[PDB]
Amino acid sequence: SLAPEDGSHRPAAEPTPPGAQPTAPGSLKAPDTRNEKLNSLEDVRKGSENYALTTNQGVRIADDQNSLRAGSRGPTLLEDFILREKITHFDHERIPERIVHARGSAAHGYFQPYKSLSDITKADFLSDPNKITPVFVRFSTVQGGAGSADTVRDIRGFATKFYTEEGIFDLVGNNTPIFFIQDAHKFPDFVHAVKPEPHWAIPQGQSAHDTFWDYVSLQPETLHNVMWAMSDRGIPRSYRTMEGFGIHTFRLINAEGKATFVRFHWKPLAGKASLVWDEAQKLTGRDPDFHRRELWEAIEAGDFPEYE
Amino acid sequence: SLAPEDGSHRPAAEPTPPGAQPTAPGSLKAPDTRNEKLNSLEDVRKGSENYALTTNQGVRIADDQNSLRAGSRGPTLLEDFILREKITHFDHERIPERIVHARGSAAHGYFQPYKSLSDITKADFLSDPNKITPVFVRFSTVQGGAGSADTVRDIRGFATKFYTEEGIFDLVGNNTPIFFIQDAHKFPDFVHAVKPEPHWAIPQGQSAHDTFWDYVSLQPETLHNVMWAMSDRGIPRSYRTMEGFGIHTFRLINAEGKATFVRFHWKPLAGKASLVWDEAQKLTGRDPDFHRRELWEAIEAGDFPEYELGFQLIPEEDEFKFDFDLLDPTKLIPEELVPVQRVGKMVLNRNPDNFFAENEQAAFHPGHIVPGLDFTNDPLLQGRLKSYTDTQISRLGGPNFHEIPINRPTCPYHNFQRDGMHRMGIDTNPANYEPNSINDNWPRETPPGPKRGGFESYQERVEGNKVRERSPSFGEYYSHPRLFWLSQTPFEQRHIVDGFSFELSKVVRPYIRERVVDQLAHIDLTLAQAVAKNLGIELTDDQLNITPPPDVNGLKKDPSLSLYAIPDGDVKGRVVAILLNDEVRSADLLAILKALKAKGVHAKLLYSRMGEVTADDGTVLPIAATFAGAPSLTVDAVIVPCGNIADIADNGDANYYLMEAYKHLKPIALAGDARKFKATIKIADQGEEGIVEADSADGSFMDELLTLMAAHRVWSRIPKIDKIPA
Amino acid sequence: SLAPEDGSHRPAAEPTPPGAQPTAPGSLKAPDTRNEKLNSLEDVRKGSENYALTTNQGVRIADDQNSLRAGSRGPTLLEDFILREKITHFDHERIPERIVHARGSAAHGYFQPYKSLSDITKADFLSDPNKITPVFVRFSTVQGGAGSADTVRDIRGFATKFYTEEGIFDLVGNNTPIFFIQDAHKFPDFVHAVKPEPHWAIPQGQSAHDTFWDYVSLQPETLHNVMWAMSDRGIPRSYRTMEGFGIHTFRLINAEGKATFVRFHWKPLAGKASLVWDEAQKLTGRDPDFHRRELWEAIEAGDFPEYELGFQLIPEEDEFKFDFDLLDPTKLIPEELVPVQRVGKMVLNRNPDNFFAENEQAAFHPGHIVPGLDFTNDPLLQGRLKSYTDTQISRLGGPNFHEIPINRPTCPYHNFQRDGMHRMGIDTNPANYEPNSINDNWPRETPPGPKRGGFESYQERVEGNKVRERSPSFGEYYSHPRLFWLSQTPFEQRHIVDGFSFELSKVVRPYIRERVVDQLAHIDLTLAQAVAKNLGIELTDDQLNITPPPDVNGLKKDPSLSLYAIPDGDVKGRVVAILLNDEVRSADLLAILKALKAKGVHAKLLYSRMGEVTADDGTVLPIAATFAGAPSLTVDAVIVPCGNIADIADNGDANYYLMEAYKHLKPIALAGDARKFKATIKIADQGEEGIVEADSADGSFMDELLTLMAAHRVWSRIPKIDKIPA
Amino acid sequence: ISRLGGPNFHEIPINRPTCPYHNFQRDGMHRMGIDTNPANYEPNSINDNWPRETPPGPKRGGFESYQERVEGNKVRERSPSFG
Ligand code: HEM
Ligand code: HEM
Ligand code: HEM
């Protein structure tokens, strides 16, 4: 039940254009792409070739096709511990999805500053143009579930974890430079209003329904981010072709103790580009994994997403 | 006071057609629709009107718009317990979704048998035609997450919780009569292979990817249900228009101890109807909630989903009388050999109040049987029995999931089990063990008997060694696929070939496509050649000479396997788009709308904008949706009344509406100058079957249109659509 | 039927003294003790008598003794869904214990004010003496697990949940009026220091180990509560005989918006009483459930625990009038400076039905306040507010813990929070957000006001920079420990020295012992020297010369800090051991039992075996327990009546009973020839205060014994116990 | 599953095997192991079917149960021999 003789089951471990080979796990596609975070995960990476099939307790399995039964047409027996572990693990695979931004696509990479920022901040990851910081970035929609579609009309998240020498810094931003509401106390109200309505749990991935527009009509502070959502910003061509923003004013603190107010931005070096509505909506049906796929294939092709 | 003065925020508490009023919680929409289960939920239903807003501890909130801060521009303070509760509860709203069938839509209803089945089963819910059993039914897809789309190509789940006077019975079935695999030990393999691939978590709601077809190519036992999924069975028009099956052979046990083998069926009283692939795919985009919405709105309209429960019954002494093993879940029992005997009717007549509380938390499990029913050694059923209680420990947070309101029996339940997370019941029994003397041994065991007796397993003889071995009787894989194929109409067979062709075209590794084509050549050469041609694959001389599998007990077809070979059309509950213009012929619209109403067919009035238009006689017509807003995908037929057609003749959306409905084989009727649209869809002057046209919508115009709607789609149009650019 | 013919399996549903009947769930023992909370639980109470045993799905079980197997010696079969459900529920019975206060014992009761406090608070529960508020109170230790022992040396928790008409108010206090630390940031440090050490998880229920004393020696703020723990406060006789304190300064807010600072007090109406250390430690071995049992049996007997709620009230303008900071929870407010105003009484009159469902799952949280109360900036209180809701997410499984029956408010609760694990309430509101129009904005905010108003924080002025810095006003550590020390009687002081001496002897690293003695020398030289002498440590020159800390606002003692300085003894509910012989003088028993009954003091009749003995007039005397089976540790006094003393005079166990009681300073009474036992306790011919002796047990002998009992223990005996080997 | 929080309790360090363990099980709360296998199912061709079943044998073989003879009816019944 094996591989074709020609080795065509296995993608080449070199950059290849979208469609040219089957996609594959990053460490097998690009084994020589490394950074300090990717290497540190080696303790938990598990291979598979040449290894025997076992239970989680390390017992080799001889027949992974059949339950233990009393005769070959008889009842399954309680002492089949190999069936039991396998089905138990399956039965507990799912964990709760994120309350918001449940739909999202992620990749590893690295950051470096162009020059030291020590005059305005003592943050170590911005102190030296030749000190590189690994990152992990997840891009997301907001409203829909983890199995909802990519090219919906929605705000997009753009979350970067920087693994710095002085701690993890997470820059948890969106693709518009404002949010819909002013005070966190209203967040469950706003989110409840945009999410599927509670009697029937419709609509998925859409603010196009009564509760969302009800809230907006009654809370004019939402109008600014609503304008953004209704423009073609709401339907990016790719996570590579949208802007990012931390939205809030934060502070930078330098070694002298001086505070400077700061708002964060990501500029996409592939430029800004969006779909048009009819195309975005139809694409949720023809390929609901369009942005996930496009990101993954850009990285396999060497079109690495870059942001300033 | 934020509601509009005119009370138009609030839907009428009476049955109303789809889109007429906002949808609402079932107990608000239909407060007078009751059954024993819905009434037992009253203890936990919570209203809202006229009540003060409070924390969960009952403290009234004064300002639900602001956090507590030091200064109106200052920092938020830790002492804000009201903000803290409200955000904590939001932060923990989600629970794990179901491992499979995570996407599903549910409703309350009731079941009653047509006659007492006491001669064959002592099951209390089937003992008396006047005994009504409340039900809760959830329909679902299989692969996709809870946020995935409805009209994917996939198998559908059909699960019924019968709240009986002798315990909960859950009939947890699907919409095809077999499963993909034989032994539960392979379920994680099969499901892993169909679900999104583990490196990148693509694709959602689709079997059209390498790992699924790699597994199918290596496990020919799957081919039978793969045939059903590749047919139009995989894309139903509505949960009201698909069949349901328990798949496994179970047992009925009567009061005298006699066991009869049984397979369970549900027959849709609305008939069998499916979409076509392009329409279903495109509909996952334009309305990924289409089935959920359709079910809720049918119920709000009074088009209650009805199903007839049927049994295929096989005497114990006939176990070995077929060419296939009755315990093999990849084999169906053809109705030509063993007819379905009608047993009773289920009506689904009220929506839930809160989807999460009642739908998302419902827990069904096929091990929940009641005296009068029993299992067999089907090795797929046998393994299911270990899964459905276990999974509920994480999904629903512990062993007291039966105390979540929707899951509660309506009959008594008492035992010595105690504690666990979220324990609601406060037990007063002095004893938590038996045997006990300190409570005189209560609650007590009950012997089996003809009614109200304790459960005892049928004493089936077991004989064999402890083995991990598939029965040799299960090792046949192609005859049932072939029977299914031969039973389909020519247009159904085309759709099957196109399903395989589309799916295998998304398989990136070509050797897998070839291997699947080789399996198809073991089933039927015509099917294999037609899929191969679509894939640019040439069968070898060896493939062309594979001998066809034998007939199934002498049958070379069984028409009950087809959706369409035997007409069972029912137009009630269907919907028609009506494409308006700014000066509609009011007489056409009168004739159209009243004819639809008389047959319970709904209408949606469409235009190029919202608001109103005024008919020729001054009648003000409210617009339900724009042509783009409610695409032809969402209706069963399209009518264009006469009027000022030049208004919409150059509207690309209007023209495309007709081309889309035409490609997808829907009836189209054109009155008066609306016949100018004939050139958009290339209709000959003299007309064509499946297009209704006349000088006005009067006389036989609506009857002819309704006749087409009864037949569902215009299959004869298939050759003409290949050419059209839509 | 397994119950005995005579019905002696079932306890009478009437008040009965400790040991007279088997104990029972509260709604069976006292079915007509009612309050609004107990009544509202009726919807989840489950009975048992006369019901069939079923699965949780309602299926009747026939054979609850056997698994389903293939043959009666064969393998168990996966299809046994009855065995699976029963074992699955058992497998998941346990939930995490509380992080602290895991060991605790709880009862239902009610509270009523003595007068309307509307001049000082708009809290609805305090507004009217006829307003009765149901409570559920849980007492606890702090350090040990849910299965650790009750009579350890520890602080005790005293948590009351008030089910008011305007919200749940939880008063989550302890039995000492301060805490060990100042800022909540240190809580995990202090708790990790006192809890079992991390390498080997020893010792359970004890602070007597290196890490606790290391932390104390390095954090002098702890020393005040450390003084209380080492005093006999740390070892209460009963939860009925200790004080309760909220510890923090809170605020009362009246209808005019005026804030008054308040600290809360509970005064035990049975008086203050504690064990002695040897007795407490031995009782953790003989009955680790002693306090839980005492509370349960006191309520079953009608000896309801009663407490008076007290407030210390300080006007806002007086915030800085003391030489300690009102916000510093390591500081007490001496009653000599601010008297406790008696505000109402709380009576605990019914045990739970199911310990797990009602005690283990109860969730209390000091942030649960109601309109009319508010917080202060006490930095320990502030951080508590973040802990008690968060911890309930893992302990009780999610954010719907307020829907677990015991935690539910009895007043209305309505808001827009939805979902979460084990969601019971099914919301029918069309809206789950506000502002909404589609339900006319209901449930709606309510402005604050004199009654039934929404919650608004008191608008305290905040001025300062964002800093992690301890207020300099908190930086004084020795004056309150000294005030406490000087307020104790000389025997209380000796017990303190002995607590420190015993604990520090168990610290393996001697430098920690020396550092703690250094701290003591900053409090009081006499205390420091006495502990040092017991540890073989010599104070330095410098230590001998440490200036004692200042008085507290001119106070050099406050007798309200002593357990015993001011008599407040109550004998009702106490217990006397009566040591029988095989021919007891019936006239003694009549007199003894009569006099005890008059004062509500219980008795237990003890002998050297179970069954009965017969008194001189043929009265049959049932035996409650043996001398070894119910040790003197478990009683408040011992009486030996006359009769055939030779039956018992060389019973080692009888003599021991009397030596142990004597060592533990318990009143002993000896009648007639019972005076032969004077030799085993070395009592002089002419008597000794604390030993009652006469020719027979007349009413004079009993009045004397009962007067010793009112004074709890015989402190004058201390210098004499040194010599007895017990 | 409730005591240790999910189905990956064998990845808690004290419970981990010291010998190799490789199979097609995935996910579950607190998942530590990061699987690189292209396949999470078998039979598969895309990873040449690895990791693979192993026949039983004298050493290093896969587990097979002893083929004990089973004969009787499906009963809930204590063996009289235990009485
Ligand atoms: C400026 C406005 C906000 C932005 C830019 C933002 C951004 C995001 C992003 C990008 C994620 C997904 C992170 C990931 O990929 O896992 C996320 C998750 C989340 N956010 Fe926010 N958010 C905002 C406001 C809020 C507010 C006001 C709250 C609640 C007070 C909130 C609560 C959450 C929660 C509960 C998650 C799920 C986090 C998790 O499960 O790990 N967000 N947010
Ligand atoms: C005849 C073959 C099968 C049929 C007809 C079937 C049908 C269904 C249906 C309809 C549901 C959804 C119930 C709902 O709406 O909540 C479901 C859920 C489920 N099934 Fe099956 N199933 C089959 C085979 C299996 C097998 C072999 C296993 C594993 C041994 C399995 C394990 C599960 C689990 C884990 C769930 C989630 C159940 C829950 O979370 O409540 N199923 N199945
Ligand atoms: C004056 C100081 C404090 C007092 C009087 C006090 C009192 C109590 C009491 C009586 C309980 C047991 C309630 C029950 O019976 O279920 C308890 C539990 C608890 N406390 Fe405190 N406590 C104090 C300080 C703190 C601090 C500073 C923290 C954390 C910052 C904390 C966190 C907790 C937690 C986690 C529990 C377990 C709560 C639960 O599981 O429901 N406590 N406390």
Side-chain angles (χ1 to χ4, degrees), chain B residues 369-386:
Chain B
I369 53 160
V370 291
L373 302 178
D374 212 336
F375 306 118
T376 64
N377 293 334
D378 176 320
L380 187 67
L381 170 60
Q382 285 272 320
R384 289 181 73 197
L385 303 183
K386 185 246 168 264

Side-chain angles (χ1 to χ4, degrees), chain B residues 15 24 59 156 379 545 550 555 611 684 719:
Chain B
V59 169
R156 299 313 194 272
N545 285 311
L555 260 13

Side-chain angles (χ1 to χ4, degrees), chain C residues 97-101 138-140 156-159 172-174 178-179 181 183-184 187-188 245-248 329 362-364 380 383-384 387-388 391-392 395:
Chain C
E97 72 187 18
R98 294 166 173 69
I99 317 300
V100 281
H101 300 257
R138 182 169 180 283
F139 303 104
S140 55
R156 299 310 197 274
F158 188 157
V172 185
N174 279 346
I178 68 288
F179 200 64
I181 60 172
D183 183 315
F187 192 76
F245 302 92
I247 294 179
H248 311 284
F364 297 87
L380 187 66
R384 285 175 82 195
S387 171
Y388 293 71
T391 197
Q392 285 149 20
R395 186 167 71 86

